[PDB]
Amino acid sequence: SYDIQAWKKQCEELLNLIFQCEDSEPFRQPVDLLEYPDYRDIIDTPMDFATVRETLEAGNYESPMELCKDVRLIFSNSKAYTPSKRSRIYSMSLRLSAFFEEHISSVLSDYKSALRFHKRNTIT
Numbered sequence: 001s002y003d004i005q006a007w008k009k010q011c012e013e014l015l016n017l018i019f020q021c022e023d024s025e026p027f028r029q030p031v032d033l034l035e036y037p038d039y040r041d042i043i044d045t046p047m048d049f050a051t052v053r054e055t056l057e058a059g060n061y062e063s064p065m066e067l068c069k070d071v072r073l074i075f076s077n078s079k080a081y082t083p084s085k086r087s088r089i090y091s092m093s094l095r096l097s098a099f100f101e102e103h104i105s106s107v108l109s110d111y112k113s114a115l116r117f118h119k120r121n122t123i124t
Protein backbone atom coordinates (compact mmCIF):
# COMPACT_ATOMS: atom_id res chain seq x y z
CA SER A 1 0.00 0.00 0.00
CA TYR A 2 1.31 3.58 -0.80
CA ASP A 3 -1.44 5.19 1.38
CA ILE A 4 0.38 7.94 3.40
CA GLN A 5 -2.57 8.11 5.90
CA ALA A 6 -3.09 4.34 6.55
CA TRP A 7 -0.85 4.30 9.68
CA LYS A 8 -3.44 6.17 11.82
CA LYS A 9 -6.15 3.48 11.75
CA GLN A 10 -3.45 0.75 12.00
CA CYS A 11 -2.23 2.45 15.23
CA GLU A 12 -5.83 2.81 16.53
CA GLU A 13 -6.33 -0.99 16.02
CA LEU A 14 -2.96 -1.83 17.66
CA LEU A 15 -3.93 0.36 20.69
CA ASN A 16 -7.22 -1.55 20.88
CA LEU A 17 -5.24 -4.88 21.01
CA ILE A 18 -2.91 -3.39 23.73
CA PHE A 19 -5.94 -2.31 25.86
CA GLN A 20 -7.26 -6.02 25.64
CA CYS A 21 -3.85 -7.36 26.86
CA GLU A 22 -3.84 -7.98 30.64
CA ASP A 23 -0.15 -6.91 30.54
CA SER A 24 -1.21 -3.27 29.71
CA GLU A 25 -3.19 -2.72 32.96
CA PRO A 26 -0.39 -0.77 34.83
CA PHE A 27 0.12 1.49 31.74
CA ARG A 28 -3.48 2.43 30.73
CA GLN A 29 -3.69 5.64 32.86
CA PRO A 30 -1.20 8.25 34.14
CA VAL A 31 0.76 6.80 37.15
CA ASP A 32 -0.65 7.70 40.65
CA LEU A 33 1.81 9.94 42.62
CA LEU A 34 -0.02 9.08 45.93
CA GLU A 35 0.75 5.35 45.25
CA TYR A 36 4.37 6.28 44.21
CA PRO A 37 5.40 9.64 45.80
CA ASP A 38 9.06 9.49 44.52
CA TYR A 39 7.96 8.56 40.90
CA ARG A 40 8.35 12.23 39.60
CA ASP A 41 11.91 12.51 41.14
CA ILE A 42 12.93 9.49 38.91
CA ILE A 43 10.75 10.05 35.74
CA ASP A 44 11.02 13.40 33.86
CA THR A 45 8.23 12.71 31.29
CA PRO A 46 5.31 10.46 32.37
CA MET A 47 3.53 8.61 29.56
CA ASP A 48 0.69 6.06 29.37
CA PHE A 49 -1.52 4.45 26.68
CA ALA A 50 -4.58 6.67 27.29
CA THR A 51 -2.40 9.76 26.66
CA VAL A 52 -1.06 8.11 23.44
CA ARG A 53 -4.62 7.30 22.24
CA GLU A 54 -5.90 10.83 23.02
CA THR A 55 -2.90 12.42 21.21
CA LEU A 56 -3.63 10.19 18.14
CA GLU A 57 -7.38 10.97 18.20
CA ALA A 58 -6.71 14.75 18.58
CA GLY A 59 -4.67 14.67 15.34
CA ASN A 60 -1.50 15.63 17.27
CA TYR A 61 0.77 12.91 15.80
CA GLU A 62 2.14 13.67 12.28
CA SER A 63 3.69 10.18 11.80
CA PRO A 64 3.73 6.71 13.36
CA MET A 65 7.38 7.36 14.39
CA GLU A 66 6.18 10.00 16.86
CA LEU A 67 3.57 7.53 18.32
CA CYS A 68 6.30 4.85 18.55
CA LYS A 69 8.60 7.27 20.48
CA ASP A 70 5.84 7.91 23.10
CA VAL A 71 5.02 4.15 23.46
CA ARG A 72 8.76 3.39 23.88
CA LEU A 73 8.83 6.08 26.66
CA ILE A 74 6.14 4.09 28.57
CA PHE A 75 8.54 1.11 28.56
CA SER A 76 11.73 3.08 29.35
CA ASN A 77 9.93 4.78 32.30
CA SER A 78 9.10 1.26 33.65
CA LYS A 79 12.73 0.02 33.23
CA ALA A 80 14.02 3.17 35.10
CA TYR A 81 11.44 2.88 37.97
CA THR A 82 11.89 -0.95 38.62
CA PRO A 83 13.83 -1.93 41.80
CA SER A 84 14.50 -5.39 40.17
CA LYS A 85 14.55 -6.66 36.53
CA ARG A 86 12.59 -9.69 37.95
CA SER A 87 9.68 -7.45 39.24
CA ARG A 88 5.99 -8.03 38.23
CA ILE A 89 5.11 -4.61 36.60
CA TYR A 90 8.52 -4.35 34.78
CA SER A 91 8.05 -8.00 33.63
CA MET A 92 4.62 -7.10 32.15
CA SER A 93 6.29 -4.10 30.42
CA LEU A 94 8.81 -6.42 28.69
CA ARG A 95 6.11 -8.74 27.31
CA LEU A 96 3.96 -5.82 26.18
CA SER A 97 7.02 -4.14 24.53
CA ALA A 98 7.76 -7.35 22.54
CA PHE A 99 4.11 -7.52 21.37
CA PHE A 100 4.15 -3.79 20.40
CA GLU A 101 7.44 -4.01 18.49
CA GLU A 102 6.22 -7.13 16.59
CA HIS A 103 3.10 -5.24 15.40
CA ILE A 104 4.50 -1.67 14.83
CA SER A 105 7.28 -2.94 12.46
CA SER A 106 4.97 -3.21 9.37
CA VAL A 107 3.16 0.08 10.24
CA LEU A 108 6.50 1.96 10.13
CA SER A 109 7.78 0.13 7.02
CA ASP A 110 4.54 0.82 5.06
CA TYR A 111 4.46 4.50 6.08
CA LYS A 112 8.11 5.12 5.16
CA SER A 113 7.65 3.26 1.80
CA ALA A 114 4.53 5.42 1.07
CA LEU A 115 6.46 8.65 1.76
CA ARG A 116 9.31 7.53 -0.49
CA PHE A 117 6.81 6.69 -3.31
CA HIS A 118 5.25 10.20 -2.86
CA LYS A 119 8.72 11.82 -3.31
CA ARG A 120 9.80 9.42 -6.16
CA ASN A 121 9.82 12.49 -8.54
CA THR A 122 10.30 15.33 -5.91
CA ILE A 123 13.36 16.90 -7.77
CA THR A 124 11.85 16.40 -11.34
Ligand SMILES: C[C@@H](CNC(=O)N1CCN(C(=O)c2cc3sccc3s2)CC1)C(C)(C)C
Nearest residue numbers: 026029030031032078081082083087089090
Ligand atom coordinates in the same frame (compact mmCIF):
# COMPACT_ATOMS: atom_id res chain seq x y z
C1 LIG B 1 -2.13 1.35 37.51
C2 LIG B 1 -2.00 2.78 38.06
C3 LIG B 1 -0.81 3.47 37.37
N1 LIG B 1 0.32 2.57 37.19
C4 LIG B 1 1.12 2.24 38.17
O1 LIG B 1 0.74 2.30 39.34
N2 LIG B 1 2.37 1.84 37.87
C5 LIG B 1 2.79 1.43 36.53
C6 LIG B 1 4.07 2.14 36.13
N3 LIG B 1 5.08 1.82 37.12
C7 LIG B 1 6.12 1.05 36.76
O2 LIG B 1 6.45 0.92 35.58
C8 LIG B 1 6.79 0.25 37.73
C9 LIG B 1 7.96 -0.50 37.55
C10 LIG B 1 8.01 -1.50 38.49
S1 LIG B 1 8.76 -3.05 38.59
C11 LIG B 1 8.30 -3.18 40.25
C12 LIG B 1 7.48 -2.18 40.68
C13 LIG B 1 7.24 -1.27 39.62
S2 LIG B 1 6.16 0.05 39.34
C14 LIG B 1 4.72 2.37 38.43
C15 LIG B 1 3.41 1.75 38.89
C16 LIG B 1 -3.32 3.62 38.00
C17 LIG B 1 -4.56 2.73 37.96
C18 LIG B 1 -3.36 4.54 36.78
C19 LIG B 1 -3.43 4.52 39.24
